[PDB]
Amino acid sequence: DLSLTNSSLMPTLNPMIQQLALAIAASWQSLPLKPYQLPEDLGYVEGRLEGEKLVIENRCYQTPQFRKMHLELAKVGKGLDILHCVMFPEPLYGLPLFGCDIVAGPGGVSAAIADLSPTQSDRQLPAAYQKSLAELGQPEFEQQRELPPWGEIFSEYCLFIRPSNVTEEERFVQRVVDFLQIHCHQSIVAEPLSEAQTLEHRQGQIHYCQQQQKNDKTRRVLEKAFGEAWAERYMSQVLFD
Ligand SMILES: [Cl-]
């Protein structure tokens, strides 16, 4: 397999991020993972910010169905805990791209976001996905919504909660687990699209990374720790290349 056991952050990371990472690892191992190549220096990053230590662990993999599967874990200061995960689909198969984030600090999880995004030119998800995402039921959480106007990028099943307690923390992990299973299954039964389409899905992912690359707030922090040029290289090389 490819485990998180040699991770220096897992022991100090917020328990929900631990569960997600572990849940996301269980999922990707059922898959035929191959190593993805991220800039040598960016696999493990350490620095200072406002005097506090910051660290990040990027884990990358790939399969004939997925161009790049990224797992990002980071601790910045005694507060900010971050979990970031994205599965980049290989255009030829027309799958949606998975993606979730966890932001937490001393007082628990501030934001938990997960979704299967439409790589289509029309912003729709395959019929199958909708047939399964619907059959899962309605997600009941206290804190939700507020997706910005550039949320044009994500699908309609997007779960953007702010955990109201430990109960919901594991509900959100279960729902993420659910999506991953549906996604891993559509993965094996996926088939090559027509060269016309393996480009329009090569338009969506392209458009996706470019949009995220301009609104993802991981940047500002990176700029304060290492500056503009380093932040830019990280955004377009690590997060959303
Ligand atoms: Cl901004």
Side-chain angles (χ1 to χ4, degrees), residues 1-77 79-241:
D1 288 348
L2 289 310
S3 62
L4 299 73
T5 38
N6 288 279
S7 170
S8 80
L9 302 187
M10 279 293 294
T12 54
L13 276 171
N14 166 283
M16 180 177 200
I17 296 182
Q18 280 182 34
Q19 290 151 29
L20 243 313
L22 286 172
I24 289 169
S27 169
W28 292 358
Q29 297 169 309
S30 69
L31 240 33
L33 303 193
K34 293 217 314 170
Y36 188 87
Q37 203 48 61
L38 285 170
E40 44 299 318
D41 64 306
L42 307 180
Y44 177 80
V45 15
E46 178 173 298
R48 317 295 307 194
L49 216 188
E50 311 191 280
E52 292 181 294
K53 195 175 188 180
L54 91 44
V55 181
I56 310 165
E57 301 176 348
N58 296 298
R59 284 176 173 79
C60 245
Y61 302 102
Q62 58 149 43
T63 62
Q65 288 53 247
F66 297 107
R67 171 177 76 83
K68 172 198 200 178
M69 292 171 254
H70 184 208
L71 171 49
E72 184 194 49
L73 297 173
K75 271 197 137 294
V76 189
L80 185 64
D81 272 6
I82 301 176
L83 176 151
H84 172 85
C85 189
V86 177
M87 302 178 79
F88 288 105
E90 197 73 72
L92 183 65
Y93 291 112
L95 291 167
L97 47 82
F98 177 74
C100 68
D101 305 275
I102 304 293
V103 167
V109 188
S110 52
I113 310 79
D115 184 83
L116 280 169
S117 295
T119 58
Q120 287 194 66
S121 314
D122 63 348
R123 261 59 163 170
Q124 299 319 309
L125 284 176
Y129 282 81
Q130 305 196 70
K131 209 311 185 71
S132 294
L133 303 173
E135 295 184 305
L136 285 177
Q138 72 159 305
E140 67 171 16
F141 292 73
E142 221 69 44
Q143 283 96 303
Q144 289 173 37
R145 207 72 180 186
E146 93 155 54
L147 202 68
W150 68 289
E152 60 164 59
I153 275 296
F154 308 77
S155 63
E156 58 274 11
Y157 293 88
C158 172
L159 186 54
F160 176 17
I161 81 157
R162 187 289 235 179
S164 51
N165 66 56
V166 182
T167 283
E168 302 194 339
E169 277 183 33
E170 305 165 359
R171 187 174 297 161
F172 177 99
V173 175
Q174 185 63 262
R175 172 48 56 108
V176 175
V177 159
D178 296 330
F179 294 165
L180 284 179
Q181 266 157 186
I182 300 169
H183 201 78
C184 286
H185 170 49
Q186 289 302 322
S187 171
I188 309 165
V189 296
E191 287 191 359
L193 289 297
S194 65
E195 298 311 70
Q197 318 220 64
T198 132
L199 279 182
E200 69 182 301
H201 284 305
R202 179 173 291 293
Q203 101 76 187
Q205 198 199 312
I206 282 284
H207 171 74
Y208 174 83
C209 288
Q210 295 191 306
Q211 277 294 283
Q212 281 294 161
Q213 191 176 297
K214 296 175 180 57
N215 301 57
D216 199 27
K217 230 64 289 181
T218 307
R219 185 189 291 276
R220 202 293 262 295
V221 180
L222 305 190
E223 273 167 345
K224 297 186 63 168
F226 326 91
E228 22 273 274
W230 194 95
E232 175 60 358
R233 175 174 169 259
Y234 186 93
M235 295 309 310
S236 54
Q237 243 77 82
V238 176
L239 289 186
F240 318 107
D241 86 67

